Amino acid sequence: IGAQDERLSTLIHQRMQEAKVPALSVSVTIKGVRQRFVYGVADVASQKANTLDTVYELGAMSKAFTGLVVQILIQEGRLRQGDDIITYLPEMRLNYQGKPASLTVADFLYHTSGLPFSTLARLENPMPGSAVAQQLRNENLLFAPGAKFSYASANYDVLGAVIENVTGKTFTEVIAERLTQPLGMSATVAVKGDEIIVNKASGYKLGFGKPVLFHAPLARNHVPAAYIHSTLPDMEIWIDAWLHRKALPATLREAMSNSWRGNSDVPLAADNRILYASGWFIDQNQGPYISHGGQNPNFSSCIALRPDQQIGIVALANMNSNLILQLCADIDNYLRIGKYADGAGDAITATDTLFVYLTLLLCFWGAVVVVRGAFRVYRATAHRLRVRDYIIALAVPGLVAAMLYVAPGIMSPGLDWRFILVWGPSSVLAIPFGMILLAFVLTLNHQIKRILL
Amino acid sequence: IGAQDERLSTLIHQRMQEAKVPALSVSVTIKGVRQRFVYGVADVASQKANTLDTVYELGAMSKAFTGLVVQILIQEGRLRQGDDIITYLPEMRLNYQGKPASLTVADFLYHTSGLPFSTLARLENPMPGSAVAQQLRNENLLFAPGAKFSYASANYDVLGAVIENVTGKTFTEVIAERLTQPLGMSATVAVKGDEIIVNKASGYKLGFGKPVLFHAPLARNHVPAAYIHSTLPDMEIWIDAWLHRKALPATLREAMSNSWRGNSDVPLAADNRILYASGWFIDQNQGPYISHGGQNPNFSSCIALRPDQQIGIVALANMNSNLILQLCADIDNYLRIGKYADGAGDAITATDTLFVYLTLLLCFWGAVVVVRGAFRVYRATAHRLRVRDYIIALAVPGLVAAMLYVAPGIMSPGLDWRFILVWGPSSVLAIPFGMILLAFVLTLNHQIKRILL
Ligand SMILES: COC(=O)[C@H](C)NC(=O)[C@@H](CC(N)=O)NC(=O)CCCc1ccc(Br)cc1
Ligand SMILES: COC(=O)[C@H](C)NC(=O)[C@@H](CC(N)=O)NC(=O)CCCc1ccc(Br)cc1
Ligand SMILES: NC(=O)C[C@@H](NC(=O)CCCc1ccc(Br)cc1)C(=O)O
Ligand SMILES: NC(=O)C[C@@H](NC(=O)CCCc1ccc(Br)cc1)C(=O)O
Ligand SMILES: [Cl-]
Ligand SMILES: [Cl-]
Ligand SMILES: [Cl-]
Ligand SMILES: [Cl-]
Ligand SMILES: [Cl-]
Numbered sequence A, B: 001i002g003a004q005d006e007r008l009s010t011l012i013h014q015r016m017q018e019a020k021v022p023a024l025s026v027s028v029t030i031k032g033v034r035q036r037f038v039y040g041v042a043d044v045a046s047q048k049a050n051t052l053d054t055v056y057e058l059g060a061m062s063k064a065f066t067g068l069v070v071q072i073l074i075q076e077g078r079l080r081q082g083d084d085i086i087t088y089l090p091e092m093r094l095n096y097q098g099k100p101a102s103l104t105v106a107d108f109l110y111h112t113s114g115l116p117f118s119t120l121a122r123l124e125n126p127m128p129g130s131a132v133a134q135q136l137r138n139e140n141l142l143f144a145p146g147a148k149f150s151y152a153s154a155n156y157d158v159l160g161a162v163i164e165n166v167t168g169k170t171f172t173e174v175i176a177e178r179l180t181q182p183l184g185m186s187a188t189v190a191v192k193g194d195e196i197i198v199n200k201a202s203g204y205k206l207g208f209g210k211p212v213l214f215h216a217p218l219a220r221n222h223v224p225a226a227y228i229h230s231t232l233p234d235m236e237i238w239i240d241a242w243l244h245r246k247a248l249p250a251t252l253r254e255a256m257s258n259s260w261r262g263n264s265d266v267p268l269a270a271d272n273r274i275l276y277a278s279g280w281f282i283d284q285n286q287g288p289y290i291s292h293g294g295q296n297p298n299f300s301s302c303i304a305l306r307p308d309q310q311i312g313i314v315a316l317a318n319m320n321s322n323l324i325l326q327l328c329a330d331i332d333n334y335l336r337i338g339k340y341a342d343g344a345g346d347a348i349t350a351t352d353t354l355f356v357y358l359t360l361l362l363c364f365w366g367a368v369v370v371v372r373g374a375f376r377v378y379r380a381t382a383h384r385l386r387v388r389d390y391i392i393a394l395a396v397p398g399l400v401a402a403m404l405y406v407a408p409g410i411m412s413p414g415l416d417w418r419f420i421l422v423w424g425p426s427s428v429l430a431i432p433f434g435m436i437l438l439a440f441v442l443t444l445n446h447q448i449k450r451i452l453l
């Protein structure tokens, strides 16, 4: 019944400019009164506008969907959170101290399973004939199940496989029949792959200071953790369902109430006593404040609810940015006290900037060697031999490239260049190449500069 | 009425061994039933035992004392938290955007003042004829007063100066008459300097893997933030007063109740909605959980209260360790759920280890140059000239030392080597020295190896 808040709009434009995301869509609910902020382009090359129809990957905001469906099957008596995972995924052996470990459904709901960080690299790589249980079989857990909170995205991929086993249905179908169809979220879907979705934003990723179109992987097994697709009107319906459950049938209502119950049975750090529930963080400080970010290789998003004040906040963007991950908290500060802190830092940006300077140094280092060599070749001389000369100068770059290829596997067991390339800036690949190229021209110069008679 | 908890004792011994602190004293209260854990040596060289009489610097757990006295003067009508600091410290000009800023008593209570981190270096350096207002005069604030939470130790030194101005008494005297004498904390004192305190632990600091005796500065102006001295029985009385206020006079009771009221008028981060009150952190998660650590150059400590369960936890140690800063949370996890996470990392240890490897590399680099040079001098030859040779080879180490001396001031304006040496491991000083020593022997070798005819 009145214009939207211009200080709110200012904040969001500012964070959009700092984030450099091509598209940003935001919706703020405050006791029915909703405000919408829909800016930028969903596709840069074709100048396709960000509209309310624009579809986004939800990232880890997918987990609230998966977790709620788990709580629906629990509420219907088809599952127990105390059930052992082997009852539903019989081939998933997971070891602690060399011995098969008992993992419960609760362990995956609450990230108390022990799966190493590298299970993200396996689940996100498309593997067309491999079930989740095979991709994770014989993984070495970091700690005894239940012993601490340790976030791992693939925990919710295990839960998607449980859903399918319990129902005998595809994950796509269960989400539709249990969530999107009952709630009326007619533009939300769990995808089956990288099939073409009309209205989906193109996804972008920072490279040399600018957003670069990035075609990210979309592995069918990883959809329950990362790849539910939605729109801003559907996410407002999502928000409104969590805030207003009267109109909802009792099984969905009960499941929701059980979905916001955080796991208190883990050690808490001195500066963080926040609990994780069924795909949400639960914070009692200036709360209840229920929240979750969504970080994909080339999408990012955030959601936060303050149900006692009837507040819901969702942001969607087609680039991975920490400024979008934090924007919901910024907007909550704004609604709460009318102020907000400066833009947080961003790992992709800092890394991208570090790599611009590093490849520039390699050019200056390389051009110093080229200009120095042409000055030698022009001022002096110029008036099976070239074989052994071309052999010693070519092994060094090929040997520098050999060590470069294995270095990720060694310094961090479980990760590979494929994973690094998916998540890091577009500029990462110029670091190895400028290195082997420099190591090429350096070895050649010294091999030839020893031929001076 | 029963033996102390052996799983608790195990935890504390383990964290003591991992921390490597020479002395550790811990007290846990649970509804009257207290347990005590008093281990190690207060002085290593003389093998002086850690006893209940052993006195410790409280670090930033001093601030709860200062803050409570502030709230006593507020409760007595001698001060308002909304009062401008210039009313009591008339010469302290503090600038925001080149212009004198209005700072309140509340700004310093709640760390919403804008004082840069480097004000710690000024307040901790003894300055015998300088008031706090002069040490801070014309400082450039990081942000508009009140605009965010930003911890700075010197904020409580400003409050100690307010106490003295309001009362016309020394800080030592006000603490005694308003806190330690009424509560019966007969071994707690705000010190005036580095005068000899009988029973005080020696303080230690990590160096080359081992604790090294360290005589830290003790500036009179910085006592309200860092240097209140207490004992474990006195800290149990402290804890018990905060938990049990009936027996207390109403002014002290009221001041205490106002001392646990956190400042909600600052932006909160997505992962941290904890408030700061009058020298305590206030956390509603699995709470109220009221806590504060104490980190000095060569002491560390922690305190945490869970008043609804009548729980108080204090730890005191005579070395700066993150394992002691986190131990209170570990013990709270233990009491709460019977488990606890692994030992957190420690910055001093990681830095000390990094420097051991760096100075070892400099020896290997240096010994490679020495052995290579004696092999040249013995195999070959050995059968105003030495002046210009000794001049070119001596400026390089003295010029490397010149750049080394200024580098802290440049990379982080406001800090100097004096500050670095106070807080970092004993091994920090071998990094510049091995560098200038290496830069000495490298320049000499090349200057002499060019004399080969
Ligand atoms: C400097 O500021 C920060 O670091 C802020 C505070 N943190 C972040 O931005 C986090 C998001 C978060 N809040 O968790 N982003 C990431 O973790 C993604 C990094 C991905 C990546 C991978 C390989 C390479 Br090579 C480069 C980058
Ligand atoms: C690796 O693990 C960590 O970093 C943990 C998580 N953090 C810490 O230990 C913090 C304590 C804290 N919890 O705030 N310790 C310090 O900040 C003191 C560092 C002092 C210092 C100064 C100069 C130089 Br040279 C070297 C050291
Ligand atoms: N796509 C998903 O599975 C969703 C998932 N996102 C993440 O885990 C962010 C990965 C961040 C990261 C990447 C590379 C490196 Br190297 C360091 C850090 C989640 O947040 O649940
Ligand atoms: N002694 C006091 O004033 C108490 C005060 N302690 C601190 O601030 C810890 C300083 C930590 C640090 C030191 C050097 C560098 Br480089 C980085 C970080 C507090 O916690 O209030
Ligand atoms: Cl079904
Ligand atoms: Cl199918
Ligand atoms: Cl309702
Ligand atoms: Cl008085
Ligand atoms: Cl005096």
Ligand SMILES: [Cl-]
Binding pocket: B243, B244, B245, B246
């Ligand atoms: Cl009482």
